[PDB]
Amino acid sequence: QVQLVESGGGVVQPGRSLRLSCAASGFTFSSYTMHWVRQAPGKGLEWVTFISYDGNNKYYADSVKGRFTISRDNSKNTLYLQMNSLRAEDTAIYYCARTGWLGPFDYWGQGTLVTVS
């Protein structure tokens, strides 16, 4: 019954900003850490961001910092990926994935397509 739906994706142009949202349901939200993982067209999976339970700790991979900032609304059960300084390398399918309590990314979303002109 666990559902992770993402939105906000679309066709943007270099130098603009975007905001991606991930509505979550079917499970208590404040008991899991969250991830943003992206996949460039025809390429492999790449980890982007990670936010903790309380949202106090945010870890970003390289190629993204200052540009990307991750947020978490526990009151409305939604995840956020604020994407500034968008580049042609950023064009990818963005999934939000929740961490299994034992570590791995147990449940994923169907992702949103972001393309950069």
Author numbering: 1 to 117
Question: What did the paper state?
Answer:
We expressed the single chain Fv fragment (scFv) of ipilimumab and the extracellular domain of CTLA-4 as inclusion bodies in E. coli. In this complex structure, CTLA-4 presented as a homodimer as previously reported and the binding by ipilimumab didn’t affect the dimer formation. Overall, ipilimumab utilized both of its heavy chain (VH) and light chain (VL) to bind to CTLA-4 with a buried surface of 1708.9 Å2. Specifically, HCDR2 and HCDR3 of VH domain and LCDR3 of VL provided predominant contacts to CTLA-4 with partial contributions from LCDR1. The binding of ipilimumab on CTLA-4 mainly located on the front β-sheet face constituted by C, G and F strands with multiple hydrogen bonds to E68 on C strand, K130, E132 and M134 on F strand, and Y139, L141 and I143 on G strand of CTLA-4. Within this interface, VH and VL contributed equally with similar numbers of hydrogen bonds to CTLA-4, i.e. five hydrogen bonds for VH vs four hydrogen bonds for VL, respectively. The results revealed that the binding of ipilimumab and B7-1 to CTLA-4 has stereo clash to each other. The overlapped binding surface on CTLA-4 by B7-1 and ipilimumab was also predominantly located on both F strand (K130, E132, M134 and Y135) and G strand (P137, Y139 and L141) of CTLA-4, the very region occupied by VH and VL of ipilimumab. These results indicated that the blockade mechanism of ipilimumab was that the VH and VL of ipilimumab binds to the same region on CTLA-4 by B7-1 or B7-2 and thereafter prevents the binding to CTLA-4. The variations in the loops may be explained by the flexibility of these loops while none of these loops were participated in the interaction with MAbs or B7-1. These analyses revealed that ipilimumab and tremelimumab bind to the same region on CTLA-4 with distinct binding mode, mainly contributed by the VH of these two MAbs.
